[PDB]
Amino acid sequence: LKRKITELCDKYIRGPNIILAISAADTDLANSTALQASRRVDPRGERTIGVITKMDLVEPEKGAAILSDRQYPLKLGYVGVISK
Numbered sequence: 287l288k289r290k291i292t293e294l295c296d297k298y299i300r301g302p303n304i305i306l307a308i309s310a311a312d313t314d315l316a317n318s319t320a321l322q323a324s325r326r327v328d329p330r331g332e333r334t335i336g337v338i339t340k341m342d343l344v345e346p347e348k349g350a351a352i353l354s355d356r357q358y359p360l361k362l363g364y365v366g367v368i369s370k
Contacts (some may be wrong), residue, residue: 341353
């Protein structure tokens with residue numbers, strides 16, 4: 287079931303589509319599957335952009351930690367935004 291869903295996701299991400307990964311601020315970056323699979327199919331991080339969501343409930347220090355990181359840099363950068 288879950289394995290089947292992942293299988294589709296993997297197939298789709300593989301080919302050179304511009305992949306849009308999102309990440310909740312509550313979950314740690316390494317922890318989230320979205321960015322982890324984005325790094326799985328794209329090691330250079332050249333064709334994937336990141337969005338950090340649910341960012342209203344964190345310190346600005348926290349935003350700086352997340353919006354700008356060096357642990358996992360990519361072209362096109364990350365974009366933090368609160369949607370709701």
